[PDB]
Design a protein around this motif. Structure first.
Motif, PDB file in Angstrom:
ATOM      1  N   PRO A  97      37.398  29.057  42.599  1.00  0.00           N
ATOM      2  CA  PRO A  97      36.551  28.330  41.654  1.00  0.00           C
ATOM      3  C   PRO A  97      35.484  27.406  42.253  1.00  0.00           C
ATOM      4  N   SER A  98      35.718  26.903  43.462  1.00  0.00           N
ATOM      5  CA  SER A  98      34.758  26.030  44.124  1.00  0.00           C
ATOM      6  C   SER A  98      33.413  26.726  44.366  1.00  0.00           C
ATOM      7  N   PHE A  99      33.439  28.037  44.577  1.00  0.00           N
ATOM      8  CA  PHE A  99      32.204  28.799  44.712  1.00  0.00           C
ATOM      9  C   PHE A  99      31.532  29.094  43.386  1.00  0.00           C
ATOM     10  N   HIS A 100      32.207  28.755  42.286  1.00  0.00           N
ATOM     11  CA  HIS A 100      31.665  28.921  40.950  1.00  0.00           C
ATOM     12  C   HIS A 100      31.122  27.637  40.361  1.00  0.00           C
ATOM     13  N   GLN A 101      31.703  26.496  40.726  1.00  0.00           N
ATOM     14  CA  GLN A 101      31.427  25.195  40.110  1.00  0.00           C
ATOM     15  C   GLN A 101      29.958  24.769  40.120  1.00  0.00           C
ATOM     16  N   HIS A 102      29.403  24.504  38.950  1.00  0.00           N
ATOM     17  CA  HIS A 102      27.984  24.172  38.758  1.00  0.00           C
ATOM     18  C   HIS A 102      26.973  25.223  39.206  1.00  0.00           C
ATOM     19  N   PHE A 103      27.421  26.473  39.360  1.00  0.00           N
ATOM     20  CA  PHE A 103      26.532  27.580  39.665  1.00  0.00           C
ATOM     21  C   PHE A 103      26.508  28.654  38.591  1.00  0.00           C
ATOM     22  N   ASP A 104      27.165  28.414  37.453  1.00  0.00           N
ATOM     23  CA  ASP A 104      27.142  29.333  36.301  1.00  0.00           C
ATOM     24  C   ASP A 104      27.723  30.697  36.640  1.00  0.00           C
ATOM     25  N   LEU A 105      28.717  30.709  37.521  1.00  0.00           N
ATOM     26  CA  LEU A 105      29.327  31.953  37.962  1.00  0.00           C
ATOM     27  C   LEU A 105      30.744  31.996  37.383  1.00  0.00           C
ATOM     28  N   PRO A 106      31.379  33.171  37.287  1.00  0.00           N
ATOM     29  CA  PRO A 106      30.826  34.470  37.685  1.00  0.00           C
ATOM     30  C   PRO A 106      29.803  35.032  36.706  1.00  0.00           C
ATOM     31  N   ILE A 107      28.897  35.871  37.210  1.00  0.00           N
ATOM     32  CA  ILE A 107      28.013  36.652  36.350  1.00  0.00           C
ATOM     33  C   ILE A 107      28.828  37.578  35.452  1.00  0.00           C
ATOM     34  N   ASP A 108      28.218  37.994  34.349  1.00  0.00           N
ATOM     35  CA  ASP A 108      28.912  38.764  33.307  1.00  0.00           C
ATOM     36  C   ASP A 108      29.427  40.130  33.759  1.00  0.00           C
ATOM     37  N   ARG A 109      28.721  40.785  34.681  1.00  0.00           N
ATOM     38  CA  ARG A 109      29.184  42.066  35.235  1.00  0.00           C
ATOM     39  C   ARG A 109      30.383  41.989  36.195  1.00  0.00           C
ATOM     40  N   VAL A 110      30.840  40.793  36.561  1.00  0.00           N
ATOM     41  CA  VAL A 110      31.986  40.670  37.465  1.00  0.00           C
ATOM     42  C   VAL A 110      33.234  40.254  36.704  1.00  0.00           C
ATOM     43  N   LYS A 111      34.310  41.015  36.876  1.00  0.00           N
ATOM     44  CA  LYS A 111      35.606  40.733  36.254  1.00  0.00           C
ATOM     45  C   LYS A 111      36.650  40.587  37.356  1.00  0.00           C
ATOM     46  N   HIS A 112      37.646  39.725  37.119  1.00  0.00           N
ATOM     47  CA  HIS A 112      38.689  39.453  38.104  1.00  0.00           C
ATOM     48  C   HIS A 112      40.060  39.874  37.605  1.00  0.00           C
ATOM     49  N   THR A 113      40.782  40.637  38.422  1.00  0.00           N
ATOM     50  CA  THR A 113      42.164  41.050  38.140  1.00  0.00           C
ATOM     51  C   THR A 113      43.082  40.180  39.012  1.00  0.00           C
ATOM     52  N   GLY A 118      31.937  35.865  49.759  1.00  0.00           N
ATOM     53  CA  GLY A 118      30.663  35.210  50.019  1.00  0.00           C
ATOM     54  C   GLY A 118      30.306  34.126  49.038  1.00  0.00           C
ATOM     55  N   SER A 119      29.093  33.605  49.244  1.00  0.00           N
ATOM     56  CA  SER A 119      28.647  32.335  48.701  1.00  0.00           C
ATOM     57  C   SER A 119      27.256  32.366  48.022  1.00  0.00           C
ATOM     58  N   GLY A 120      26.772  33.554  47.658  1.00  0.00           N
ATOM     59  CA  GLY A 120      25.562  33.689  46.839  1.00  0.00           C
ATOM     60  C   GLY A 120      25.902  33.712  45.365  1.00  0.00           C
ATOM     61  N   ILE A 121      24.998  34.244  44.565  1.00  0.00           N
ATOM     62  CA  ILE A 121      25.155  34.266  43.122  1.00  0.00           C
ATOM     63  C   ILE A 121      26.008  35.460  42.730  1.00  0.00           C
ATOM     64  N   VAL A 122      25.594  36.656  43.103  1.00  0.00           N
ATOM     65  CA  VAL A 122      26.424  37.844  42.878  1.00  0.00           C
ATOM     66  C   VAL A 122      27.692  37.799  43.739  1.00  0.00           C
ATOM     67  N   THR A 123      27.554  37.502  45.034  1.00  0.00           N
ATOM     68  CA  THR A 123      28.721  37.516  45.918  1.00  0.00           C
ATOM     69  C   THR A 123      29.672  36.341  45.628  1.00  0.00           C
ATOM     70  N   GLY A 124      29.128  35.201  45.206  1.00  0.00           N
ATOM     71  CA  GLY A 124      29.948  34.085  44.732  1.00  0.00           C
ATOM     72  C   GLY A 124      30.700  34.379  43.437  1.00  0.00           C
ATOM     73  N   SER A 125      30.128  35.242  42.589  1.00  0.00           N
ATOM     74  CA  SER A 125      30.840  35.764  41.430  1.00  0.00           C
ATOM     75  C   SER A 125      32.005  36.691  41.810  1.00  0.00           C
ATOM     76  N   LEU A 126      31.819  37.524  42.834  1.00  0.00           N
ATOM     77  CA  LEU A 126      32.881  38.392  43.332  1.00  0.00           C
ATOM     78  C   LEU A 126      34.025  37.537  43.843  1.00  0.00           C
ATOM     79  N   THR A 127      33.667  36.512  44.601  1.00  0.00           N
ATOM     80  CA  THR A 127      34.603  35.491  45.067  1.00  0.00           C
ATOM     81  C   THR A 127      35.426  34.920  43.903  1.00  0.00           C
ATOM     82  N   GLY A 128      36.748  34.891  44.084  1.00  0.00           N
ATOM     83  CA  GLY A 128      37.688  34.474  43.046  1.00  0.00           C
ATOM     84  C   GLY A 128      38.220  33.074  43.240  1.00  0.00           C
TER      85      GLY A 128
END
Ligand SMILES: *Cc1c(COP(=O)(O)O)cnc(C)c1O
Ligand SMILES: *Cc1c(COP(=O)(O)O)cnc(C)c1O
Ligand SMILES: [Ca+2]
Ligand SMILES: [Ca+2]
Ligand SMILES: [Ca+2]
Lengths: 454, 455
Positions: free
Chosen positions: A165-181, A153-163
Motif C-alpha cells: 500500500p505504501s506504493f499506492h498512498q497519495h498516488f491514486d493507485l492501483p489503476i483500474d486495469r490492475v487487480k490483485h489476488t 516497481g514504483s511507477g504508476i502502472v508498475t506501482g499499481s502492479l505492486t501489492g
C-alpha cells in the motif's frame, strides 16, 4: 568536508524512499557510503558493515570487483554510447542478448529488450501485453492480475502492479486495469489448511477473480517466483503447477518478475527454472549487473515474439524505445558480471551457502517464542516476529519490532532489512558469502534480537 | 564474425524503435557502431561518419572523452553502487545535486531526484503532481495537459503525455487523465495568422480546454521549451509569457521537459532560462551525462518541495524509489560531463556556433522551392520539405523525402535524422561542433538534398 556534504545532501538531494522532512531537517541522520569489498561496506566515518542485504538484493557478486570496473572502463573508453534505434547496435549488447537466451533464460525464450530499471522493464511488459492483444483483435483483453504484497516497481502502472500500500498512498493507485489476488503465504493461511489445501484455496480465489472480471478481459498474470520485498515468501509446493494450469486454461499470459530471483539468487538460474515456471515474458534487473551499472531486460518468448513480428508487418514499427536502451557501458558491466557468476559458479554457492543460511537461522531462531516463522530459499531468508506464536498474532505495529532489531543489528555492524509488511527481518547477502560469514551474520543478528526481546 | 554478430543480433536482440520483422529477417540491415571521437563515429567495417545528431540529442561534449571514462572507472572501482534509500548517500550524488541547483537550474529550484531515463523522470513528475494535490486536499486536481507532437517518453503514462501517435498505437494511449492542446508551430498555424495571432490562438485553445475540463481538475501542464522529436520547433515569440499567465491564473503546475534543451543545447543553461520559463518542476537527462552513463533527474521547486515535506510529516515516508536511484557511477559520469561543459564553455560555443548553423542553413536552403521552412535555435535545426511551398502542401508520405535525403547524406558520411512527424530533416550536433564543421555538415546535406530534389 563531511559536515558540508551532509548539509548539501539535506538541502538538495531528494532520496528514494526517505522521509522528506525528517531527512531535510536532520531528524533522520544521513549516511554516506564511500567504499566496499566482498560483503562489507564502509561509511564516511570509517565504520565497516557486513551487508547481508547486498544493497537491495542486487550486489550479487560482491563489492569492489576491479574486473567489472575494468570492463566498464574499457567500454566507456572505446564507445560509451550510441543508440540502438533503427537496427543499430554495439558489440556488448549483441553478446549479452545471446548469452541471456542461451545460458540463463528458460527454454522457449527468444528476444531481449533493455532498459535501466526493474520498473521500466515491467512498464515495457504491460505495453507488450496490450500490444499483443490489440494486434490479435482482442481490444478488451487488457487487465493485469498481480498479488497482494507483491513488488513490481514504483511507477504508476508498475506501482499499481505492486501489492504494497505504501506504493499506492497519495498516488491514486492501483489503476483500474490492475487487480490483485491472494498472497501465497502458507503460514498465513485460512487457518488449518494443508499446504495442498492452501494451494487449492489460492486457485479458487484466482478462479473467482477471473469469473468476476471475465477471462476474455484478462491479458496477464504477473508474479515474483519468490516474493521479495513483500516479505521473503517462497511459494507453496504445488502452487506454480496449479496456477499455471488456470492461466493456460483461460489463455492468460504469465509474466515472471525475476528482478530479485534472477541470475543465481535462489541457487538456480532463475526462479522460473527453480519452480518449473514457463513464463511468456520475464523481467530482470539487479543481479543482471550486480548493480555495477543500471540495466534491466525484458525476455520475450517465441510465442509472443511471433505476434510482435506479425504486428510489425501489419502495422509497421512498434513505438517503443528508451534513449539509453542497450547502453554499451551497462551491457559491458553485465557481461563481466555474468563471466564472474559463471566462472565462480556463484549459482552453486548460492544453493550451498544459502541452505547453510537457512539451517543456521532455524537453529538460532526456530525455537524462540517471539519468532513466528523462519523461512527462505537459496540466498534469501527471513524471520517473522509474533507477539504470540501459538495464536499467530502480530505485535502492535507501533512497537516496531522488526525495525528495532534492524537498528540494533546496524549498531553492531550488520545490515539486514526490516521489510515493509508486518514485523519481518530480511536477509539477502551477496552470492559470494561464505559459511563463516553466515555464522558471523547470524551471531550478530541473534545478539541484536535478544537485546530487543528482553 | 561480424556476420555472426549480425545473426546473433537478428536472432536475439529486440531493439528500441526498430521494425521487428524487417530487422529479424534481414530486410532492415543492422549497423554496429564500434568507436568515435569528437563529432565522428565509426562502424564495424571502418566507415566513419559525422554525427550531426549527437546520438539522440545527447552526446553533447562529443565522443571519446577519456576524462569521463576515467571518472566512471574511478567511481566503479571505489564504490559502483550502494542504495540511496532511508537517507543513504554517496558523495558524487551529493555534489551533483548541489551543482545542478547552484549552477544549472533556474532560481527557486531546491531538490533533485534521480532515475536513469527521460521517461522515468516524467513518470516521477506525474506521481509528484498527484501526491502534491492529494496532500493539499484536492483529490480531483489530477489531469495533465500536454501538446500535440510533444515527446515526453515511451511508457504508458509518459507515452500518453507524448503527442505523437506512433507511441500510442496498440497501447491504448493516451490515458484518460492526459489531454492534448495545440502544437505551437507557427508554420502550421491556421492559415494567414501573424505570429502574435497564432500565440493568441494557442492561448484561446488552452483556455477552451481548461473551461471544458475545469481548472479544478487540472494538476499540470507539461512541455518542451523547444520541441525535439516532434519536429525541432522553437516556440513563437511571446508564447511562453502568454502560456505562463494562463497556467498561473488557473493554479496549474508547469513542468518543463528539458531532456533535450538541458545543459547547454540552446546556448543557455536550459530552455527555461532561454525563454524566461519559471517551471515548478523540471525534467532532465541526455546532456546531463552526454549519454556516457544513463541518468535522469527531476528538479523540484521550493514551493513543491515544501508540500512534499508537509506530506511526509502528515502521512510519513513517500512511497517512491528506483533501486538505482542516485547510482554512483552515473552520478560520477555526470560530474565529469559538467566539468567539461563548464571548463570548455560549451554553452557559449552552442550559442555562437548554433547561431552560425541557423545562418548557414538559411543561406543554403531558405530560397529553395522544395524547402517549406528552415528553423532552429542554438544547436538544434531542421529543414521541412514541401511539394508546394506557397500552398504549404506536403509530399505524399509514401514518397518519404526526408528519409531519402537522410539516406543520401549517410552514403556521403553524414548522420542527420528524418524526424517521425512530417518530411523533416533534423540537426542536433554535439556542442563541441566548430563553425568549419557546420559548413562541412551543410555542404554534405546540401549535395544530398539536390540529388533527391533532382528526382
Ligand atoms: C526492486 C524490484 C523491481 C523494480 O526495480 P527498480 O530497478 O527499483 O525499478 C521490480 N520487481 C521486483 C521483484 C523488485 O524486487
Ligand atoms: C528523448 C526524450 C524523453 C525520453 O527520454 P528517455 O531517456 O528516452 O526515456 C523525454 N522527453 C524529451 C523531451 C525527450 O527528447
Ligand atoms: Ca548491541
Ligand atoms: Ca585520462
Ligand atoms: Ca559529398
Amino acid at each position: 568536508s563531511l559536515e558540508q556534504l551532509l548539509e548539501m545532501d539535506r538541502a538538495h538531494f531528494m532520496h528514494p524512499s526517505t522521509h522528506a522532512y525528517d531527512h531535510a531537517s536532520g531528524a533522520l541522520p544521513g549516511r554516506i557510503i564511500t567504499g566496499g569489498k566482498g560483503i562489507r561496506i564502509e561509511d564516511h566515518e570509517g565504520r565497516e558493515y557486513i551487508d547481508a542485504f547486498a544493497g537491495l538484493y542486487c550486489v550479487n557478486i560482491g563489492y569492489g570487483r576491479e574486473e567489472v570496473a575494468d570492463a566498464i572502463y574499457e567500454q566507456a573508453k572505446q564507445l560509451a554510447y550510441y543508440h540502438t534505434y533503427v537496427g543499430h547496435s554495439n558489440d556488448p549488447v549483441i553478446e549479452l542478448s545471446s548469452r541471456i537466451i542461451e545460458d540463463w533464460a528458460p527454454a522457449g525464450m527468444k528476444k531481449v529488450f533493455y532498459g535501466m530499471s526493474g520498473s521500466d522493464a515491467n512498464e515495457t511488459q504491460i505495453k507488450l501485453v496490450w500490444y499483443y492483444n490489440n494486434v490479435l483483435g482482442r481490444p478488451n483483453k487488457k487487465k493485469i492480475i498481480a498479488r497482494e504484497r507483491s513488488y513490481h516497481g514504483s511507477g504508476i502502472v508498475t506501482g499499481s502492479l505492486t501489492g504494497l500500500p505504501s506504493f499506492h498512498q497519495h498516488f491514486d493507485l492501483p489503476i483500474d486495469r490492475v487487480k490483485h489476488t491472494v498472497c501465497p503465504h502458507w503460514y498465513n493461511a485460512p487457518p488449518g489448511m494443508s499446504e495442498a489445501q492452501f494451494v487449492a484455496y489460492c486457485v479458487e480465489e484466482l478462479e473467482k477473480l477471473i469469473a468476476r472480471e471475465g477471462a476474455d478481459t484478462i491479458a496477464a498474470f504477473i508474479a515474483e517466483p519468490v516474493m521479495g520485498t513483500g516479505g521473503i515468501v517462497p511459494p507453496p509446493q504445488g502452487y506454480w503447477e496449479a496456477i499455471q494450469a488456470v492461466l493456460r486454461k483461460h489463455d492468460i499470459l504469465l509474466i515472471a518478475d525475476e528482478v530479485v530471483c534472477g541470475f543465481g539468487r535462489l541457487g538456480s538460474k532463475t526462479g522460473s527454472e527453480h519452480y518449473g515456471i514457463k513464463p511468456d515474458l520475464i523481467t530482470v534487473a539487479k543481479g543482471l549487473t550486480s548493480a555495477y551499472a543500471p540495466l534491466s531486460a525484458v525476455i520475450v518468448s517465441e510465442k509472443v515474439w511471433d505476434v510482435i513480428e506479425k504486428g510489425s508487418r501489419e502495422h509497421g514499427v512498434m513505438g517503443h524505445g528508451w534513449t539509453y536502451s542497450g547502453h554499451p557501458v551497462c551491457a559491458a558491466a553485465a557481461l563481466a558480471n555474468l563471466d564472474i557468476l559463471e566462472r565462480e559458479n556463484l549459482t552453486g554457492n548460492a544453493a550451498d551457502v544459502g541452505a547453510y543460511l537457512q539451517q543456521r537461522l532455524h537453529e538460532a531462531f526456530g525455537a524462540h517464542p517471539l519468532v513466528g516463522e523462519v523461512r527462505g530459499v537459496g540466498m534469501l531468508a527471513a524471520l517473522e516476529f509474533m507477539a504470540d506464536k501459538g495464536a499467530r498474532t502480530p505485535f502492535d505495529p507501533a512497537l516496531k519490532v522488526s525495525q528495532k532489531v534492524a537498528a540494533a543489528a546496524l549498531e553492531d555492524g550488520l545490515i539486514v532489512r526490516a521489510l515493509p509488511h508486518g514485523d519481518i527481518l530480511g536477509f539477502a547477502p551477496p552470492l559470494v558469502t561464505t559459511r563463516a560469514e553466515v555464522d558471523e551474520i547470524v551471531a550478530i543478528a541473534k545478539e541484536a534480537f535478544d537485546e530487543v526481546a528482553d
